[PDB]
């Protein structure tokens, strides 16, 4: 199963939001959006979450971004399977 096209889709769809989360490209447990939902607020630390990551990428952020990445990758893989591609 390792190295398959669905494996590549899953690792990319789980790893890309994880990278976008740390570098400020994606919403974060410290970086939220306002009322509009497009622009990202500056990093704020009222949650009291700490990490050894220099950019403050918390384990809660890892869990949340990995969860959303798994959801999106599962949707992508199941969509490509049903169309007859993959």
């Amino acid at each position: 199963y390792l190295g398959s096209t669905t494996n590549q889709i899953m690792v990319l769809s789980t790893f890309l939001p994880l990278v976008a989360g740390r570098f400020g490209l994606a919403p974060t447990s410290t970086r939220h959006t306002n009322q509009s939902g497009i622009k990202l607020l500056p990093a704020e630390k009222s949650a009291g979450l700490v990490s050894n990551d220099p950019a403050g990428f918390n384990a809660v952020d890892v869990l949340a971004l990995g969860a959303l990445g798994h959801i999106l990758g599962c949707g992508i893989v199941l969509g490509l399977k049903s169309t007859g591609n993959l």
């Binding site: 199963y1 630390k45 009222s46 949650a47 009291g48 979450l49 700490v50 990490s51 050894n52 990551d53 918390n58 384990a59 809660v60």
Partner: protein, 241 residues
């Protein structure tokens, strides 16, 4: 909020993957006291404010300590009969010497060579555990009792100490180890780390038993034979068969 800076390097000093999993809420009360305190409480279950019932820091610490001791006993009892049957020292077939086939779950396996059936053993075990755990409970509620009432002379060693998790009388600390408080704290940390490893091991043994229908030592041997094929993902097809 941003934690408290000076309260964080206490978690960074113990090294490892800690501090990555601690929070500002946890470090409000987790200030280095009690053994095993590595700041890991993301849910805030030991917050002393508004703490009652069993969600209470001393009760939760007591539960952790006796859970980890019971899991150390359970892990050693999981891995001893199978490693003795594999060596052939005991006259038990290694498929029978598996811990969950020892009569704990009769659907999972039965051992009919005990001197009584498991229900009689459970009856006397219920009586004996009722004795032991109820005296333990009343010593927790009153940390000076259980030595004032006669118990065939056994009440002399039931005085305990200030901590319910650490009685350490003439019986509970018969060899008298940890004479000096820092050695006692170090050995307490030893106990809690070994017991939490054993809690993880007991959960793993249960999951492997459901997963592979074989003993944990057999699973370790099969994994060491071919780690690429014999793993969680490689055994994902044949799980209850």
């Amino acid at each position: 909020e941003g934690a408290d800076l000076a309260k964080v390097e206490r978690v960074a000093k113990v090294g490892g993957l800690y501090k990555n999993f601690t929070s500002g809420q946890a470090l409000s009360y987790l200030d280095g006291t009690l053994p095993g305190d590595f700041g890991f409480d993301p849910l805030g279950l030991c917050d002393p404010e508004g703490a009652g019932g069993f969600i209470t820091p001393e009760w939760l610490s007591y539960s952790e300590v006796i859970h980890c001791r019971w899991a150390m006993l359970g892990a050693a009892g999981f891995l001893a009969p199978e490693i003795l049957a594999t060596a052939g020292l005991i006259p038990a077939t290694p498929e029978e010497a598996v811990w969950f086939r020892s009569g704990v779950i009769p659907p999972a396996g039965q051992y009919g060579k005990y001197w009584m059936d498991p229900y009689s053993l459970f009856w006397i075990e219920a009586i004996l555990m009722n004795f032991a755990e109820l005296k333990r409970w009343q010593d927790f509620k009153e940390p000076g009792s259980q030595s004032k009432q006669y118990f065939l002379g056994l009440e002399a060693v039931f005085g305990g100490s200030g901590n319910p998790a650490y009685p350490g009388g003439q019986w509970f600390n018969m060899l008298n180890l940890g004479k000096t408080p820092e050695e006692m704290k170090k050995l307490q940390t030893n106990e809690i780390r070994n017991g939490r490893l054993a809690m993880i091991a007991c959960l793993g043994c249960a999951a492997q038993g459901v997963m592979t229908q074989k003993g944990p030592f057999a699973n370790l041997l099969e994994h060491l034979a071919d780690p690429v094929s014999n793993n969680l993902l490689g055994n994902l097809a044949t799980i209850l068969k």
